[PDB]
Amino acid sequence: GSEFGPWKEDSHIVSAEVGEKCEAIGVKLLHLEDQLLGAMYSHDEALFQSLQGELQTVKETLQAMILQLQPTKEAGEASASYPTAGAQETEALVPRGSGFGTSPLTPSARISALNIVGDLLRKVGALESKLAACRNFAKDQASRK
């Protein structure tokens, strides 16, 4: 129930969403890669369908992650003159106030989150290029002439 609540917006939910999501990311590339090579010399079609569903699902997680990291929701517009807040970072040794920025959270999860996002999109690009390259290599082999 949390009578007080050590968090406000992001603290455990954002840290938990990355944990489960991340685990899914790896298991995805693992199953895809293993299925790509095997299906590659099989029917060179199983990898195509897998990529489509893998690209759509991953995009969904990439969208929710990037959105959660980049605030874009407010109550009312034209409402910003004086900064009000009970306590942003008073319990800690470093008294952090508020103003001149939204500030998602302490410098730890922000970097980590953006770290997986970039590392994820990077892995997808390399995998996509490999699939497109392999397909073209096999597609331009049957004809030859």
Swiss-Prot record:
PTM comment: Ubiquitinated. Ubiquitination with 'Lys-48'-linked polyubiquitin chains leads to its proteasomal degradation.
Entry comment describing in which tissues the protein is expressed: Expressed in granule cell precursors within the dentate migratory stream during the first week of postnatal life and in differentiated granule cells of the hippocampus (at protein level). Detected in heart, brain, kidney, and testis. Expressed in dentate gyrus, hippocampus and in the olfactory bulb.
Region (Interaction with NDEL1): 42-75
Region feature Interaction with NDEL1 and PAFAH1B1, mapped onto this chain: 5-92
Name of the protein in question: Disrupted in schizophrenia 1 homolog
Compartments where located: Cytoplasm; Cytoplasm, Cytoskeleton; Mitochondrion; Cytoplasm, Cytoskeleton, Microtubule organizing center, Centrosome
Region Interaction with PAFAH1B1, residue ranges: 5-92
Taxonomic classification: Eukaryota, Metazoa, Chordata, Craniata, Vertebrata
From-to range in the entire protein, with total length: 765 to 852 of 852
Assembly and interaction partners: Interacts with NDEL1. Interacts with CCDC88A (via C-terminus); the interaction is direct. Interacts with GSK3B. Interacts with tubulin alpha, ACTN2, ANKHD1, ATF4, ATF5, CEP63, EIF3S3, MAP1A, NDEL1, PAFAH1B1, RANBP9, SPTBN4, SYNE1 and TRAF3IP1. Interaction with microtubules may be mediated in part by TRAF3IP1. Interacts (via C-terminal) with PCNT. Interacts with CHCHD6. Interacts with CCDC141. Interacts with FBXW7, the substrate-recognition component of a SCF (SKP1-CUL1-F-box protein) E3 ubiquitin-protein ligase complex; the interaction targets DISC1 for proteasomal degradation.
Chain spans, region Disordered: 73-92
Role this protein plays: Involved in the regulation of multiple aspects of embryonic and adult neurogenesis. Required for neural progenitor proliferation in the ventrical/subventrical zone during embryonic brain development and in the adult dentate gyrus of the hippocampus. Participates in the Wnt-mediated neural progenitor proliferation as a positive regulator by modulating GSK3B activity and CTNNB1 abundance.
Disruption-associated phenotype: Loss of function of DISC1 in the dentate gyrus of adult mice results in reduced neural progenitor cell proliferation and the appearance of schizophrenic and depressive-like behaviors.
